[PDB]
Design a protein around this ligand. Structure first.
Ligand SMILES: *CC(=O)C[C@H](*)C(=O)O
Ligand SMILES: *CC(=O)C[C@H](*)C(=O)O
Lengths: 354, 355
């Protein structure tokens, strides 16, 4: 049996496994993720998939922190595999840590830091407390790992009825292909969600076939794992609306924190967003996240495709993302060794271009 | 405060199909029988079903039930079933799960040295007599569970239903197995029962259910409150050698059963029995889209003089009903305390499924 704190962040699940896991080696969180992925993938499958989960479930395993200064180690998972970072799950974990007492709250504290050691690096979170409560969280922010536009105006050819599209590749904790919905000929709407999933899958697969990406500081991150499809906002408070397609072409119900970070890095690189300016991203559900670019930095002697010959070094930015998570369940998940679906199942069919 | 309005559940599944069995958290629900309590919930507290069944706490193919104290004489537990669209009068897989959960979690006592434990369910469709078959050696580990369903019957035969393209005109049987079913060969819809075709099967099932309920009036002759076709059973040749046929049942907000569906199996057996194709005691094995198997036997038959349904011939002496036993295996998959913060925008759930 495993104990879980089932959270959701504005409609998007985050199943946070807090106890009962087998002991896992690894000298950092990236190696722990690799160990799970390579040797114990049955854990993910049983916890994420039907019948205990479903095709759009998401979650994370907690571990002791390893990187200096962190409160919790975390490895994220979904219906397909393992993302190096997740903003909505980070917001959920920061929230759960404070509300359930995994991390202590100083006396008279109105903000409580919760630092996550993730496969993509250190993620500095803050739970913003409800005034007059000891540990009720109003919302939570996360300062993401450095983000960056990687490659601009990448042209890929998808099968009909999509054909040729142009995207940006950016890192926000995961590598994203960021594309306007208009180029796909699909409005972002609940009605089009299945098509959005198919386009996202086709675009992700085609991008990884034709562009080889590599995070220049983190060897293990060498694929594009997420497709961010954006368009005009519905809520007048939002700058844009988006849906991210990832995992086994599941869709984020949240605006997606890493995807927002990647979008903000891209806008910033193009001069379209100032440091400290509030950016508001809306989801397919109408949910909002707020983000701000906190700073920028050039890394001398390190280039990505977008980095100019004249430029000694790549531009990165540090972005903060804010959202609200709720506890939806305290769960003890059970696995009878004679249960034929102890490792879950899906009825979703795979798709691929011919 | 945090646990205000929470619910405790035993999350079960029966060969892949969820049964979220709510064990505490409801206030008193007015009603002098289970059918009335079901109507109360549906009319006055439907947001509870939606919050428990739907994302983010559930999903588009979740299923479950509320437990109550039994009202009907001889029953161990009251139960009201729920899904992503509404409330079925009976559910085979959830009854199998409830019998199993009752024994394994000690809701019912296991008599000294027993190998089989009866668990009787008071449902909106009537009394359902369950038996938990214990694993030899163990005190209360359940190997599988059988349920003797409420009376089942073929109701109306060769009903022509006209659906939009690419389906057009189809021929179905209507039969009662605890719910009314329209039973239809997948062949007639132009599609195979396969995971590939699941979305289409859901669409076809929903179309068929809507059209049937407009164009055909059904009425259970002994239970006034049952007067709609709630489920569509789409069947085809088996994949597993052990199975007679395969099916998928579409119901709720066009969700699909991952189990072979016990009420659908009961309706199918009553149909086969009526056509002389199954004898009393003969094992019928039904396969699901997942490859799961349920076993059924017809245990008894009765003609009810003076009571007819559309298939009852003038040559005949009252409508035929059968008593069907269904057997499957359920597992505990979790113990959950579900939370509903009043400021949570999705306290009542959501679905992204089309229209
Ligand atoms: C982990 C994801 O689902 C991508 C969106 C996010 O919140 O980072
Ligand atoms: C309750 C349902 O899902 C219909 C199938 C069955 O097991 O009776």
């Amino acid at each position: 049996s495993f104990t879980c704190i089932d959270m959701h962040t504005e409609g998007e699940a985050a199943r946070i496994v807090t106890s009962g896991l087998p002991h896992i080696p690894g000298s950092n969180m990236a190696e722990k993720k690799a160990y799970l992925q390579e040797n114990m993938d049955y854990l993910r499958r049983g916890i994420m998939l039907e019948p205990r989960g479903h095709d759009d479930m998401f979650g994370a395993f907690l571990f002791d922190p390893i990187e200096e200064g962190a409160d919790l180690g975390i490895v994220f998972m979904d219906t397909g595999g393992y993302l190096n970072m997740c903003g909505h799950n980070s917001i959920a974990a920061v929230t759960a840590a404070v509300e359930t007492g995994i991390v202590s709250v100083p006396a008279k504290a109105t903000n409580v830091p919760v630092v996550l050691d993730t496969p993509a690096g250190l993620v500095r979170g803050t739970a913003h407390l409800q005034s007059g409560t000891e540990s009720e969280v109003s919302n939570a922010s996360i300062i993401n790992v450095p983000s960056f536009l990687y490659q601009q105006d990448v042209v890929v050819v998808l099968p009909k009825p999509y054909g040729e599209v142009r995207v940006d590749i950016a890192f926000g904790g995961n590598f994203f292909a960021i594309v306007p919905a208009e180029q796909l000929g699909i409005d972002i709407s609940v009605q089009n969600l299945s098509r959005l999933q198919e386009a996202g899958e086709l675009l992700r697969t085609e991008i990884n076939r034709s562009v080889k990406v590599q995070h220049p500081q983190l060897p293990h991150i060498n694929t594009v794992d997420c497709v961010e499809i954006y368009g005009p906002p519905t809520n007048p408070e939002a700058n844009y609306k988006n849906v991210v397609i990832f995992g086994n072409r599941q869709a984020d119900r949240s605006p997606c924190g890493t995807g927002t970070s990647a979008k903000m890095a891209t806008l910033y690189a193009k001069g379209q967003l100032r440091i400290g300016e509030t950016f508001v991203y809306e989801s397919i559900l109408g949910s909002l996240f707020q983000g701000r670019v906190l700073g920028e930095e050039r890394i001398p002697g390190v280039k990505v495709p977008v980095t100019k010959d004249a430029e000694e070094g790549m531009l990165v930015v540090t972005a903060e993302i804010t959202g609200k998570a709720f506890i939806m369940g305290f769960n003890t998940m059970l696995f009878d060794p004679t249960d034929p679906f102890k490792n879950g199942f899906t009825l979703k069919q795979y798709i691929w271009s011919s």
